[PDB]
Design a protein around this ligand. Structure first.
Ligand SMILES: OC[C@@H](O)[C@H](O)[C@@H](O)CO
Ligand SMILES: [Cl-]
Ligand SMILES: [Cl-]
Length: 251
């Protein structure tokens, strides 16, 4: 890991524990990644001292792009889940059958985080906010719309998130809940050779158009645009550096 009123706009100023709160990209070429994600999503950036490049859209923080640490590596989109007391949560990880990959530490005055794996090996950050809460805009076009745990052992994984952050779920595909709020999903991965991981979806107006634009911008279409019944339409894409993520047009 690199750190080593119902109709209102979906602004966020707070995250309940268990809610995915943030995604960031660690990459081999920050400059190039910036241009690519601008091409797809229209992001601007605020560089903060390497440099952590905060992606912005309509005056709101939506994600970030970070440089790699030493060692080697394929670029990756990281997911973070909000927690009230990261130290307390971390204390439950090993008893719950997971691993603490990166022990808890303070990131400037942004917050405090740990990087863990669940018992199925899917990695996720635990984020205790100080100055930085996470995304201040979600769901809208160009922003984070869904976080999905792709794992070959959903119930085992989800028992762990219940024990450690209090996430519950219901089946319909598993929809994850932090209290009464739906905050993400979980299912078995699409193909052999896909590691268990937290998958990142950004909202788009037209999955097909975005997929075409991705290829034209030097990325790759990993899974061509396809419909998910009653949900909408998605494509799985790679940026030109190799980082995989999906785009979703919701119906
Ligand atoms: O519960 C708060 C979350 O931000 C939800 O509004 C998003 O839809 C999760 O994807
Ligand atoms: Cl470039
Ligand atoms: Cl392609």
């Amino acid at each position: 890991h690199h750190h080593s009123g119902s109709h209102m706009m979906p602004k966020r100023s707070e995250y309940r524990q268990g809610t995915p709160n943030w995604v960031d990209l660690q990459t081999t070429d920050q400059s190039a990644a910036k241009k690519f994600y601008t091409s797809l999503f229209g992001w601007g950036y605020d560089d903060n001292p390497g440099v952590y490049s905060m992606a912005t859209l309509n005056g709101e923080a939506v994600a970030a792009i970070a440089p790699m640490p030493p060692g080697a590596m394929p670029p990756i989109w990281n997911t973070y889940i909000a927690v009230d007391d990261v130290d307390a949560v971390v204390d439950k990880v090993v008893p719950g059958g997971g691993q603490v990959m990166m022990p808890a530490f303070d990131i400037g005055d942004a917050g405090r985080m740990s990087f863990i794996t669940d018992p199925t090996g899917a990695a996720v950050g635990l984020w205790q906010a100080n100055r930085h809460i996470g995304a201040t805009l979600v769901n809208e076009t160009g922003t984070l719309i869904w976080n999905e745990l792709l794992t070959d052992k959903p119930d085992l994984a989800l028992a762990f998130y219940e024990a450690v952050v209090g996430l519950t779920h219901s089946s319909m595909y598993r929809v994850l809940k932090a209290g009464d709020a739906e905050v993400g999903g979980c299912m078995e991965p699409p193909m052999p050779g896909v590691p268990n991981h937290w998958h990142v979806y950004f909202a788009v107006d037209d999955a097909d158009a975005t997929a075409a634009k991705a290829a034209a911008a030097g990325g790759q279409v990993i899974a061509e645009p396809a419909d998910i019944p009653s949900v909408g339409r998605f494509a799985v894409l790679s940026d030109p550096q190799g980082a995989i993520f999906s785009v979703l047009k919701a119906a």
